Design a protein around this nucleic acid. Structure first.
Ligand SMILES: [Mg+2]
Ligand SMILES: [Mg+2]
Ligand SMILES: [Mg+2]
Ligand SMILES: [Mg+2]
Ligand SMILES: [Mg+2]
Ligand SMILES: [Mg+2]
Ligand SMILES: [Mg+2]
Ligand SMILES: [Mg+2]
Ligand SMILES: [Mg+2]
Ligand SMILES: [Mg+2]
Ligand SMILES: [Mg+2]
Ligand SMILES: [Mg+2]
Ligand SMILES: [Mg+2]
Ligand SMILES: [Mg+2]
Ligand SMILES: [Mg+2]
Ligand SMILES: [Mg+2]
Ligand SMILES: [Mg+2]
Ligand SMILES: [Mg+2]
Ligand SMILES: [Mg+2]
Ligand SMILES: [Mg+2]
Ligand SMILES: [Mg+2]
Ligand SMILES: [Mg+2]
Ligand SMILES: [Mg+2]
Ligand SMILES: [Mg+2]
Ligand SMILES: [Mg+2]
Ligand SMILES: [Mg+2]
Ligand SMILES: [Mg+2]
Ligand SMILES: [Mg+2]
Ligand SMILES: [Mg+2]
Ligand SMILES: [Mg+2]
Ligand SMILES: [Mg+2]
Ligand SMILES: [Mg+2]
Ligand SMILES: [Mg+2]
Ligand SMILES: [Mg+2]
Ligand SMILES: [Mg+2]
Ligand SMILES: [Mg+2]
Ligand SMILES: [Mg+2]
Ligand SMILES: [Mg+2]
Ligand SMILES: [Mg+2]
Ligand SMILES: [Mg+2]
Ligand SMILES: [Mg+2]
Ligand SMILES: [Mg+2]
Ligand SMILES: [Mg+2]
Ligand SMILES: [Mg+2]
Ligand SMILES: [Mg+2]
Ligand SMILES: [Mg+2]
Ligand SMILES: [Mg+2]
Ligand SMILES: [Mg+2]
Ligand SMILES: [Mg+2]
Ligand SMILES: [Mg+2]
Ligand SMILES: [Mg+2]
Ligand SMILES: [Mg+2]
Ligand SMILES: [Mg+2]
Ligand SMILES: [Mg+2]
Ligand SMILES: [Mg+2]
Ligand SMILES: [Mg+2]
Ligand SMILES: [Mg+2]
Ligand SMILES: [Mg+2]
Ligand SMILES: [Mg+2]
Ligand SMILES: [Mg+2]
Ligand SMILES: [Mg+2]
Ligand SMILES: [Mg+2]
Ligand SMILES: [Mg+2]
Ligand SMILES: [Mg+2]
Ligand SMILES: [Mg+2]
Ligand SMILES: [Mg+2]
Ligand SMILES: [Mg+2]
Ligand SMILES: [Mg+2]
Ligand SMILES: [Mg+2]
Ligand SMILES: [Mg+2]
Ligand SMILES: [Mg+2]
Ligand SMILES: [Mg+2]
Ligand SMILES: [Mg+2]
Ligand SMILES: [Mg+2]
Ligand SMILES: [Mg+2]
Ligand SMILES: [Mg+2]
Ligand SMILES: [Mg+2]
Ligand SMILES: [Mg+2]
Ligand SMILES: [Mg+2]
Ligand SMILES: [Mg+2]
Ligand SMILES: [Mg+2]
Ligand SMILES: [Mg+2]
Ligand SMILES: [Mg+2]
Ligand SMILES: [Mg+2]
Ligand SMILES: [Mg+2]
Ligand SMILES: [Mg+2]
Ligand SMILES: [Mg+2]
Ligand SMILES: [Mg+2]
Ligand SMILES: [Mg+2]
Ligand SMILES: [Mg+2]
Ligand SMILES: [Mg+2]
Ligand SMILES: [Mg+2]
Ligand SMILES: [Mg+2]
Ligand SMILES: [Mg+2]
Ligand SMILES: [Mg+2]
Ligand SMILES: [Mg+2]
Ligand SMILES: [Mg+2]
Ligand SMILES: [Mg+2]
Ligand SMILES: [Zn+2]
Lengths: 77, 252, 91, 112, 63
RNA sequence: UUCAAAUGAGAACUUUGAAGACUGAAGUGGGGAAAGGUUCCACGUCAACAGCAGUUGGACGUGGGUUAGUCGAUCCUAAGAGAUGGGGAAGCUCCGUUUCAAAGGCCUGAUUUUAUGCAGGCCACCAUCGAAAGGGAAUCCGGUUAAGAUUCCGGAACCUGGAUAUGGAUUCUUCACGGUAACGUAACUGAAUGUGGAGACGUCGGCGCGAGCCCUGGGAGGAGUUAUCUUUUCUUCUUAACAGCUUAUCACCCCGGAAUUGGUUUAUCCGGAGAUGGGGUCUUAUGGCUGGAAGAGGCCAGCACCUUUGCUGGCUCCGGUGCGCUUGUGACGGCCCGUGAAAAUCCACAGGAAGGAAUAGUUUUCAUGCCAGGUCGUACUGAUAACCGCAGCAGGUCUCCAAGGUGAACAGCCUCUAGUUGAUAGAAUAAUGUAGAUAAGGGAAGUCGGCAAAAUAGAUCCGUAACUUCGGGAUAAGGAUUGGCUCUAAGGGUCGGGUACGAUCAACUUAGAACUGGUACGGACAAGGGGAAUCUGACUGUCUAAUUAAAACAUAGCAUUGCGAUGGUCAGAAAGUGAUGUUGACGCAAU
RNA sequence: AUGGUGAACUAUGCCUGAAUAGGGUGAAGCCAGAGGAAACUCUGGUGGAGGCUCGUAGCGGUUCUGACGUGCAAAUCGAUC
């Protein structure tokens, strides 16, 4: 039910006690007027709401995923 | 034969009065320490229509001499009273439209409304749209005071008996024709079930002293004795004269 | 463009009820719908609503009055008379 | 063309049974029932909707922070500012004229 | 097809009409259109300075 | 209604395919309330039953089926019903419901025998039942069944109660700051008591906006037609509760000080009690963007194979228009001798009892976190066969959703979606019928009587008498006109213009003018006969369900009567009984 | 005669709910204009009143003294109203 943009805040969520699972979605999407680009939504299933953080920059996306806690049960796709 | 209409009204089945919408009973303040030694101020907080009444009520609120709180009385608005006006109730109150004073405390010719028959009965005389009573004199020793009610009747009451200065609001209401059956229809819809009215002369004998015959006609004098009995008293009960009132009325 | 010769607001009733009753209604009708002067705020913005209740558009004071007109002849003389009677009692 | 049924068992058009047509992700029309509209709280003095205050149906006011139920002046959510302007002025002026009456009628008692 | 012939003016003679001139298009609608448009010409004209408030104000009530 | 197949001993009647029609969204569609009670669904199956039949069934046999913290009940009060101290009554019982009654329970303090005795203060509100349409805490979308689903599955929320820590906030100026102000916010102690708000409220009119529906352009797909013509016809292109930000008519604030009065609605209201102008504050209906969420659903293509049935790819995009239609909502306006419920419940404010920090306190109305949410209903019918009429009866029985054309239109007539195609059948077409039509010349001569029937009818224009309460009478009467096609003219929106015009996009109305036909044209449907008088009731309204709708009753209007409460009229066996009466002569009662 | 049972029909009141295509007419209020020495009189608009009106659904039940009259039906069916 929540969207999130502070990439710092996000991280802190995923290390909260109640957070057992997560999921990464990937969408094809097109930019501005012309070409496409790879959108990636990071979803953290909290106890009472699903936080989802969108990273348009596919770059930011990769070296985000390797930040993800080694203990979190991530759902890929 | 059958029980006639006017005896049926008394069991109040479909004849009780339609009441759902009414504001509350109109009443003076209880005749307490304040009101009988001095006076007490209130404010009309609203003057408002009461279903099936002809005259608007005024909600007037007061402080409670004995507790921290408000107490709201429901008055009948005298013509000219208004929201925000201050209302004074008491023996030692001043003579203004809206205040409530003991008929002993007011000069002859005073014009008041909602007056009590016995002190404290919280008001009984002249309440209807337009009516009032007039003080036509006092008699200090045994403190009685004498008024003329709207009927024309002169009557005397305790000088302690309270009344409210001025006349009741909404006057003239009856100079305007009802014009159609529907406006009487709605009129009684908010009073009681007394409309419309079948002439007994249009009924059969089972139904009414007047009923039956091969032409419609009352068949005997329609002036019935006081000492008549239920099912008998229809028409002009106890009528001491009858016929069109030629000549000026007005009590002598 | 004058619309009606004499029935005025009373034209809603058509031919019904007979002239003389319509006459009598037209009067109080005109009385009762009209806009009146406000004693308190000065603007002429008192209109009726339910008999004997008169309220101000802006400023919002409500007065009890006649069923079809703000002040009633009787009420007014009664105002004059109490006035006079009060005068005696502190003079 | 797509028509639509009530959702609760009550088949009548009452104030508690208002409907809204709605287009779902299935690509179809479905009714939704609709709570009666909330009305704006009113000034206790003058009576207008008092501004600054949220408007919900009554029990919903207990699921809402106290800031949604006030403005921050004396008599916040209760009476309407202009009404409190009047209250202050008159309070002052009257308490003042009390002092006036006291000393005037006091002097009566010294020259009469 | 037909709709075209309509907004080409066709099929609209006295013989094709069944509702009163009123019911087809209300007098009131005609007016409110017209009155709103004069009203709105006055506003911009005033606001542009093309016409001064005093003149506008007379044209308003003449409108 | 028809052809054929299938099944079966058996087929006018079952099943499937095909064709022909129908209901025509005011439904023969999709659901419900009352009532039924298993009729629902499946398998088996024809003795009775379904006024022919039967292989079929709402029949017969055997089974299966109705899942809830959020939908209802349950809670609240309405008219009203009805216990209790009492009062009547031989008594069954009747009256009273806060009434002539010693009518009761909460917050915590007091306890550290110990568990709950008393120490404060309040509160005096006096049962209870009464709404499956009134009030009311909270759930949605996709998927799934032979038969259930806002109830199951998936996912995503939210309410109430209970627990509670962590973070934030607050505090050395203890109980936040900011803004001139309207007011702002993530928070930002608050008992008794008092007050205010919400719950919470008529009706109709036009005007404004929303939603869904309707119409429609481009594009990307699938389908149909193609002798000929049509860049064509038909169809898919969707987005829930909930959450963040944003969004408003109204209202309000600050600056200002107005005649040459201005501003202004379709509707004439507003201003020295401060207009117009400029700047700001507010409600969040509603909408927008994002999260929910493309992973769903929708539409296609390309491979796979008795199989569970897969698997793999795509596309699911951008717009337009309005006196449209339905519904919603707003700011207004009309009306009233009519002014259009209640209570439970929720919040706020006034108040300041009290409690509370610097060596560390106060704070769960800010965020996040934990546990829990019982009981009963839930199938289906809702009617030319599931209900009431002895019945599968042409009767009766409360409601919501509602497409295209014609047209004023929710009319009639035709159509899409859905649903039907049920209702004994065959052959003939005598009399007499019932229902539907026509008739030369005459035209009410028929008949108690123009009964029946015929005539009239839309719209535009023209024209319109007596009489009248001046409102009417009036569509009075009487007339012309109306198709098709092709043109002409008038009626609008939006932009930039130093402090006259230009440019483009989108609408059916109205009037004029040509041409044209077997002089037809409201071409079916739809749709007033008119006039002159007498009698009679003023009018609208009312009744004899099932032989009387009328002149009968009612009504407004007029007039008469009774009554100031220790009362009038009326109820009761009685009464500390009752109607009028939440009443008071501008009233109630009786003619 | 005595003691009992009925307001599921219907009559009337009360409480709480719900329902009614599309037309014609054009009442108060309002705006602009005209005439007149004056008093005052006129015109065009706007607006949208009514136990108003044409007419569906609704509600009713006038005539055919129509159907039916061992009925579909112990009150129905059709047209007309
Ligand atoms: Mg009563
Ligand atoms: Mg009656
Ligand atoms: Mg009578
Ligand atoms: Mg009478
Ligand atoms: Mg008789
Ligand atoms: Mg007799
Ligand atoms: Mg006698
Ligand atoms: Mg007689
Ligand atoms: Mg007689
Ligand atoms: Mg349902
Ligand atoms: Mg606030
Ligand atoms: Mg707010
Ligand atoms: Mg008009
Ligand atoms: Mg318009
Ligand atoms: Mg415009
Ligand atoms: Mg003006
Ligand atoms: Mg057959
Ligand atoms: Mg058809
Ligand atoms: Mg239809
Ligand atoms: Mg059927
Ligand atoms: Mg069903
Ligand atoms: Mg049943
Ligand atoms: Mg079955
Ligand atoms: Mg057999
Ligand atoms: Mg059977
Ligand atoms: Mg048989
Ligand atoms: Mg057989
Ligand atoms: Mg069985
Ligand atoms: Mg069984
Ligand atoms: Mg609920
Ligand atoms: Mg319960
Ligand atoms: Mg009792
Ligand atoms: Mg109850
Ligand atoms: Mg309920
Ligand atoms: Mg309810
Ligand atoms: Mg589903
Ligand atoms: Mg199942
Ligand atoms: Mg089902
Ligand atoms: Mg679930
Ligand atoms: Mg979950
Ligand atoms: Mg909680
Ligand atoms: Mg802060
Ligand atoms: Mg309260
Ligand atoms: Mg209130
Ligand atoms: Mg209500
Ligand atoms: Mg479509
Ligand atoms: Mg919701
Ligand atoms: Mg502004
Ligand atoms: Mg500012
Ligand atoms: Mg409706
Ligand atoms: Mg009102
Ligand atoms: Mg509140
Ligand atoms: Mg103390
Ligand atoms: Mg909290
Ligand atoms: Mg419990
Ligand atoms: Mg069901
Ligand atoms: Mg059936
Ligand atoms: Mg039986
Ligand atoms: Mg039947
Ligand atoms: Mg069916
Ligand atoms: Mg048959
Ligand atoms: Mg035959
Ligand atoms: Mg002939
Ligand atoms: Mg002839
Ligand atoms: Mg003859
Ligand atoms: Mg002749
Ligand atoms: Mg003859
Ligand atoms: Mg004769
Ligand atoms: Mg003869
Ligand atoms: Mg005839
Ligand atoms: Mg002929
Ligand atoms: Mg005539
Ligand atoms: Mg022509
Ligand atoms: Mg043009
Ligand atoms: Mg009559
Ligand atoms: Mg009549
Ligand atoms: Mg009869
Ligand atoms: Mg009989
Ligand atoms: Mg009749
Ligand atoms: Mg007379
Ligand atoms: Mg006694
Ligand atoms: Mg009944
Ligand atoms: Mg309604
Ligand atoms: Mg209508
Ligand atoms: Mg017409
Ligand atoms: Mg009409
Ligand atoms: Mg002149
Ligand atoms: Mg009208
Ligand atoms: Mg009528
Ligand atoms: Mg009519
Ligand atoms: Mg019509
Ligand atoms: Mg009918
Ligand atoms: Mg009727
Ligand atoms: Mg009859
Ligand atoms: Mg009939
Ligand atoms: Mg017959
Ligand atoms: Mg026969
Ligand atoms: Mg009819
Ligand atoms: Zn005023």
């Amino acid at each position: 039910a929540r969207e999130i943009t502070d990439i710092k805040q996000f991280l802190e969520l995923t290390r909260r006690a109640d957070v057992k699972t997560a999921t990464v979605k990937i969408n094809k999407k097109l930019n501005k007027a012309g070409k496409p680009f790879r959108q990636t939504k990071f979803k953290v299933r909290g106890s009472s709401s699903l936080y989802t953080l969108v990273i348009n920059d596919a770059g930011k996306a990769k070296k985000l995923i390797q930040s993800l806690p080694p203990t979190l049960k991530v759902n890929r796709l | 034969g059958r029980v006639i209409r006017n005896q049926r009204k008394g069991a109040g089945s479909i004849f009780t009065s339609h009441t759902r919408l009414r504001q509350g009973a109109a009443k003076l303040r209880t005749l307490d320490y304040a009101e009988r030694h001095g006076y007490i101020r209130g404010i009309v907080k609203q003057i408002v229509h009461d279903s099936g009444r002809g005259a608007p009520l005024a909600k007037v609120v007061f402080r409670d001499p004995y507790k921290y709180r408000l107490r709201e009385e429901i008055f009948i608005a005298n013509e000219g009273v208004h929201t925000g006006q201050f209302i004074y109730a008491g023996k030692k109150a001043s003579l203004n439209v809206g205040n409530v004073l003991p008929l002993g405390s007011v000069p002859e010719g005073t014009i008041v409304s909602n007056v009590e028959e016995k002190p404290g009965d919280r008001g009984a005389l002249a309440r209807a749209s337009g009516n009032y009573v007039i003080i036509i004199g006092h008699n200090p020793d045994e403190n009685k005071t004498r008024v003329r009610l709207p009927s024309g009747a002169k009557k005397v009451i305790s000088s302690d008996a309270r009344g409210v200065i001025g006349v009741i609001a909404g006057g003239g209401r009856v100079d305007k024709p009802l014009l159609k059956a529907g406006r009487a229809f709605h009129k009684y819809r908010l009073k009681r079930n007394s409309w419309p009215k079948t002439r007994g002369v249009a009924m059969n004998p089972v139904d009414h002293p007047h009923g039956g015959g091969n032409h419609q006609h009352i068949g005997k004098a329609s002036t019935i004795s006081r000492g008549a009995v239920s099912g008998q008293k229809a028409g002009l009960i106890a009528a001491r004269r009858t016929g069109l009132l030629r000549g000026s009325q007005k009590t002598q | 463009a004058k619309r009606t010769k004499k029935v005025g607001i009373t034209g809603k009733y058509g031919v019904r009820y007979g002239s003389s009753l319509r006459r009598q209604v037209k009067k109080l009708e005109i009385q009762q719908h009209a806009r009146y002067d406000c004693s308190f705020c000065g603007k002429k913005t008192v209109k009726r609503g339910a008999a004997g209740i008169w309220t101000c558009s802006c400023c919002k004071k409500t007065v009890a009055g006649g069923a079809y007109t703000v002040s009633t002849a009787a009420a007014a003389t009664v105002r004059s008379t109490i006035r006079r009677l009060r005068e005696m009692v502190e003079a | 063309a797509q028509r639509v049924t009530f959702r609760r068992r009550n088949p009548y058009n009452t104030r508690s049974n208002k409907i809204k047509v709605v287009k779902t992700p299935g690509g179809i029309l479905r009714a939704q029932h609709v709570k009666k509209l909330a009305t704006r709280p009113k000034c206790g003095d003058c009576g207008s909707a008092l501004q600054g205050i949220s408007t919900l149906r009554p029990r919903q006011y207990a699921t809402v922070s106290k800031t949604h139920k006030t403005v921050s002046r004396a008599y916040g959510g209760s009476r309407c500012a202009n009404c409190v302007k009047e209250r202050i002025i008159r309070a002052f002026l009257i308490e003042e004229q009390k002092i006036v009456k006291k000393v005037v009628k006091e002097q009566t008692e010294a020259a009469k | 097809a037909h709709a075209q012939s309509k907004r080409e003016g066709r099929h609209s003679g006295y013989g094709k009409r069944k509702g009163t001139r009123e019911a087809r298009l209300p007098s009131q609608v005609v007016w409110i259109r017209r009155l709103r448009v004069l009203r709105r010409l006055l506003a911009k004209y005033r606001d542009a300075g093309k016409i001064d408030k005093h003149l506008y104000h007379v044209l308003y009530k003449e409108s």
